[PDB]
Amino acid sequence: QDDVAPYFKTEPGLPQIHLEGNRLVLTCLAEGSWPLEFKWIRNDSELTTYSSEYKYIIPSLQKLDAGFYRCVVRNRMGALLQRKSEIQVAYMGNFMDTDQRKTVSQGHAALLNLLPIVSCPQPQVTWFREGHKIIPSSRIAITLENQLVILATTASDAGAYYVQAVNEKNGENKTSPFIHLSVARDTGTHEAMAPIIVVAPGNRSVVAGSSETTLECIANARPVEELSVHWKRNGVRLTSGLHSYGRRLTITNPTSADTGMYVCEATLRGSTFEPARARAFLSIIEPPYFTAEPESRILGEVEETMDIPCRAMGVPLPTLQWYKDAVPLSKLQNPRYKVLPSGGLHIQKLSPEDSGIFQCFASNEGGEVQTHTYLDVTN
Amino acid sequence: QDDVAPYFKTEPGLPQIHLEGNRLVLTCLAEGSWPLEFKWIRNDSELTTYSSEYKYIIPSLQKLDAGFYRCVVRNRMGALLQRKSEIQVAYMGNFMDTDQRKTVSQGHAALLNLLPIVSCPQPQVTWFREGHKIIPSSRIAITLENQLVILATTASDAGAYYVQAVNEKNGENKTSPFIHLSVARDTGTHEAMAPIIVVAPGNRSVVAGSSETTLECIANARPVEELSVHWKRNGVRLTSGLHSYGRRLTITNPTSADTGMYVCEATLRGSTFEPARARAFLSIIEPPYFTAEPESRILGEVEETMDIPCRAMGVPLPTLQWYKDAVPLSKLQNPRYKVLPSGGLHIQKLSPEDSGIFQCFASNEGGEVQTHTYLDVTN
Numbered sequence: 001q002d003d004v005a006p007y008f009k010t011e012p013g014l015p016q017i018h019l020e021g022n023r024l025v026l027t028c029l030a031e032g033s034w035p036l037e038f039k040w041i042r043n044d045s046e047l048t049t050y051s052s053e054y055k056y057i058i059p060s061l062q063k064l065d066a067g068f069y070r071c072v073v074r075n076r077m078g079a080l081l082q083r084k085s086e087i088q089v090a091y092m093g094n095f096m097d098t099d100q101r102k103t104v105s106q107g108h109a110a111l112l113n114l115l116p117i118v119s120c121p122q123p124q125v126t127w128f129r130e131g132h133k134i135i136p137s138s139r140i141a142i143t144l145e146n147q148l149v150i151l152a153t154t155a156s157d158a159g160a161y162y163v164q165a166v167n168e169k170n171g172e173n174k175t176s177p178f179i180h181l182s183v184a185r186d187t188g189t190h191e192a193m194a195p196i197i198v199v200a201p202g203n204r205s206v207v208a209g210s211s212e213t214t215l216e217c218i219a220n221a222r223p224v225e226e227l228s229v230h231w232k233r234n235g236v237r238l239t240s241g242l243h244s245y246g247r248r249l250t251i252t253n254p255t256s257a258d259t260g261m262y263v264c265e266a267t268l269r270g271s272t273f274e275p276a277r278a279r280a281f282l283s284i285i286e287p288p289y290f291t292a293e294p295e296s297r298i299l300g301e302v303e304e305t306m307d308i309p310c311r312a313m314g315v316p317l318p319t320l321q322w323y324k325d326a327v328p329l330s331k332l333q334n335p336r337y338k339v340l341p342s343g344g345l346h347i348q349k350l351s352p353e354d355s356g357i358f359q360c361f362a363s364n365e366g367g368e369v370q371t372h373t374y375l376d377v378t379n
Numbered sequence: 380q381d382d383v384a385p386y387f388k389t390e391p392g393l394p395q396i397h398l399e400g401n402r403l404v405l406t407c408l409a410e411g412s413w414p415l416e417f418k419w420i421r422n423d424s425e426l427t428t429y430s431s432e433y434k435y436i437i438p439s440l441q442k443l444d445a446g447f448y449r450c451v452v453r454n455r456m457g458a459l460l461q462r463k464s465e466i467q468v469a470y471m472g473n474f475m476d477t478d479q480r481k482t483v484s485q486g487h488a489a490l491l492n493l494l495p496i497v498s499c500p501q502p503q504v505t506w507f508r509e510g511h512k513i514i515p516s517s518r519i520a521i522t523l524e525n526q527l528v529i530l531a532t533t534a535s536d537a538g539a540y541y542v543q544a545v546n547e548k549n550g551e552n553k554t555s556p557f558i559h560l561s562v563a564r565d566t567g568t569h570e571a572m573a574p575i576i577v578v579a580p581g582n583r584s585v586v587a588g589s590s591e592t593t594l595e596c597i598a599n600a601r602p603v604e605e606l607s608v609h610w611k612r613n614g615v616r617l618t619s620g621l622h623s624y625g626r627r628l629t630i631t632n633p634t635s636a637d638t639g640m641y642v643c644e645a646t647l648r649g650s651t652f653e654p655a656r657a658r659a660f661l662s663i664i665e666p667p668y669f670t671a672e673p674e675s676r677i678l679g680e681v682e683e684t685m686d687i688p689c690r691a692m693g694v695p696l697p698t699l700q701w702y703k704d705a706v707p708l709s710k711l712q713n714p715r716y717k718v719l720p721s722g723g724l725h726i727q728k729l730s731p732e733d734s735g736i737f738q739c740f741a742s743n744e745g746g747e748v749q750t751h752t753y754l755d756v757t758n
């Protein structure tokens with residue numbers, strides 16, 4: 001047919017992590033009446049001009065190729081945006097070539113930050129001192145951000161600490177320089193030290209359907225053997241999902257029933273001390289989905305009114321953005337194309353140049369969906 | 380601790396398709412008390428011996444590297460099988476270097492098979508004759524297996540046909556040699572020809588949650604302009620999901636409500652001819668999931684009875700296979716390890732050598748899941 005508007009035969013696949021040096025083949029698998037042309041876009045910037053080549057090939061990936069890719073397909077009838085593809089590249093930088101020094105007063109917690117290093121994705125970190133692998137315990141913690149936390153420090157904890165960082169996707173590993181931790185005398189004259197939260201749990205947001213999410217709370221106290229960290233929800237202690245000496249709470253398969261405030265509570269068992277508390281809030285993201293889509297093809301007569309419906313649901317409420325032939329409506333500046341509050345597109349007096357592909361995108365923090373129609377105008 | 384049995388920190392990811400020549404990095408991301416050792420397996424065959432290296436790296440993938448990979452992790456306490464990883468490699472072979480000949484009698488359908496070619500995944504095929512791209516129409520069909528079907532042949536259809544095959548994953552393309560189709564005179568003396576099904580729909584099975592599934596039915600008749608192909612279910616014609624001149628029925632998001640028999644029906648409109656019919660059956664596969672798992676760690680006293688529960692649901696009913704320290708129970712040939720019909724493992728008189736990792740796999744055609752426990756035996 002001479003009247004087949006462009007459409008995609010296959011949608012691009014889920015985000016995959018790619019290795020430096022590997023070949024990458026992107027493809028624009030579209031059909032339609034010909035001349036059929038394709039161009040590529042990276043980060044809303046034009047990579048290629050229009051031609052009959054539907055492939056975009058990177059012979060050897062480097063880190064600067066990481067980004068969002070999409071093709072546009074066009075024939076005489078209109079232009080259609082492919083849904084975005086997320087191309088991540090696994091890479092591991094270097095540690096800065098310098099030692100660091102840190103001093104803490106006996107009895108306080110020492111928080112040793114993982115030395116600056118750029119890595120995708122974030123590495124797995126093993127902490128060392130004098131070739132001895134440091135294992136989490138009731139007194140030693142390693143945060144979700146790979147920081148080493150030594151609780152209730154003593155003179156024995158002084159020394160030179162370092163990391164082996166491993167990028168699990170490309171296999172590369174790096175050793176950091178030293179952090180020289182010194183431990184000075186106790187502040188004042190106090191044997192026991194009340195619980196104090198040194199790593200507070202953060203606000204957490206997770207996308208619906210995710211397997212797990214983990215909150216973390218680390219407290220200092222002395223004697224550390226009496227220290228108890230526990231998690232409360234709705235004023236009542238939680239009993240399941242606890243890990244790493246009670247410092248990690250993992251919620252599995254989180255739904256909206258698990259949203260809201262969580263409280264971690266640190267106590268010295270049997271003591272007269274007040275507990276230390278910190279609050280964290282858990283939020284669920286519902287990716288967008290359409291509740292009203294237009295027909296694939298619509299015929300209007302010149303001079304009549306046209307309505308193209310598009311409505312989407314999600315948490316948070318999705319924002320809708322319209323395109324005509326792969327140009328956003330804001331750029332076209334067409335006073336006859338009215339966007340309705342519910343989301344639909346209203347066209348007051350159809351004109352022959354209104355013919356083409358209208359495309360609606362709904363997006364929030366947790367995803368993006370698309371629907372489109374070919375508008376045909378007669379006479 | 381000296382008593383941490385091996386466990387995985389991260390499960391391997393979903394099946395990805397890899398390109399020839401690309402680097403591949405597999406990783407065995409397990410923790411536990413050390414010495415901790417790892418070995419790799421490809422297609423139930425041992426690739427490497429046990430060592431402290433948790434990575435397996437293929438510098439440059441070739442087709443013969445395609446297969447199922449998994450690591451075993453072991454310390455003194457026991458051995459644990461990683462869940463399998465499916466490594467497919469995109470490849471495209473060559474057509475055989477020979478022309479073919481085919482003769483059909485005028486009015487009959489000509490079924491032109493795509494010339495033998497090994498390819499992963501199956502290529503996208505465009506059929507040609509004299510440089511002219513052949514487009515599907517009411518008289519020309521291209522099956523889901525890339526065969527060209529010319530209905531109600533005429534002398535004009537004689538000529539040399541060929542294909543451009545494109546592997547969409549690695550971008551490679553091949554042109555085939557020619558099929559020389561000849562069209563001989565009509566058989567007998569008949570103007571109209573009743574509908575006959577030349578490509579019958581097949582039994583289809585699909586995994587639950589799949590986006591789409593498509594059935595295909597192609598009929599011959601003359602005059603082809605009067606030919607109508609339609610789909611029936613429960614004795615009543617289906618109205619939605621039809622494609623390619625009614626020859627394709629796509630069921631979107633198939634559930635068990637769509638299982639059973641579908642009928643395609645070919646008629647010559649307004650004619651006295653009987654319809655031609657073919658039946659196809661659609662089946663849904665439910666991947667396995669557990670309905671009863673054992674605790675992560677279990678303590679038995681010597682000489683007592685132990686029960687390790689494992690029960691799974693799925694369509695078809697999953698089969699359960701047990702392992703101890705990554706050795707299947709059938710090999711161990713231990714008369715004290717009894718497998719119950721519901722799935723659980725029964726151990727009559729616990730002995731010290733029963734300590735270790737017991738691992739239960741449930742599988743059917745649509746997936747495989749695993750659960751495990753560390754059995755500790757005292758005294």
Ligand SMILES: *[C@@H]1O[C@H](CO)[C@@H](O[C@@H]2O[C@H](CO)[C@@H](O)[C@H](O)[C@H]2NC(C)=O)[C@H](O)[C@H]1NC(C)=O
Binds near residue numbers: 064065066068
């Ligand atoms: C394309 O856009 C992505 C998304 O913003 C960019 O990713 C950022 O890259 C910079 C480094 O250049 C980092 O500092 C940011 O943290 C990254 N943000 C995210 C969300 O990933 C990417 O660099 C862009 N690529 C190009 C070529 O423009």
Ligand SMILES: *[C@@H]1O[C@H](CO)[C@@H](O[C@@H]2O[C@H](CO)[C@@H](O)[C@H](O)[C@H]2NC(C)=O)[C@H](O)[C@H]1NC(C)=O
Binds near residue numbers: 203281
């Ligand atoms: C973490 O999330 C909580 C929960 O929303 C935030 O608390 C809100 O803070 C604003 C800012 O003053 C208040 O006006 C609201 O009353 C709070 N909402 C609720 C439901 O209590 C908090 O600000 C967030 N903090 C960070 C650092 O992200």
Ligand SMILES: *[C@@H]1O[C@H](CO)[C@@H](O[C@@H]2O[C@H](CO)[C@@H](O)[C@H](O)[C@H]2NC(C)=O)[C@H](O)[C@H]1NC(C)=O
Binds near residue numbers: 445446
């Ligand atoms: C590993 O097992 C898979 C699964 O059977 C093998 O895949 C088969 O490969 C042969 C060619 O060698 C094909 O003829 C079959 O059709 C394939 N079957 C499937 C289900 O994919 C794979 O070849 C095996 N690889 C090794 C190295 O043993």
Ligand SMILES: *[C@@H]1O[C@H](CO)[C@@H](O[C@@H]2O[C@H](CO)[C@@H](O)[C@H](O)[C@H]2NC(C)=O)[C@H](O)[C@H]1NC(C)=O
Binds near residue numbers: 582660
């Ligand atoms: C396609 O599926 C149908 C549906 O199950 C199969 O029909 C069965 O065939 C057996 C073999 O003689 C009969 O005993 C059963 O009565 C049939 N079942 C039903 C529900 O009708 C058919 O054999 C399959 N054919 C192919 C080629 O796969």
Ligand SMILES: [Cs+]
Binds near residue numbers: 294
């Ligand atoms: Cs649509």
Ligand SMILES: [Cs+]
Binds near residue numbers: 672673674675750751
């Ligand atoms: Cs378990």
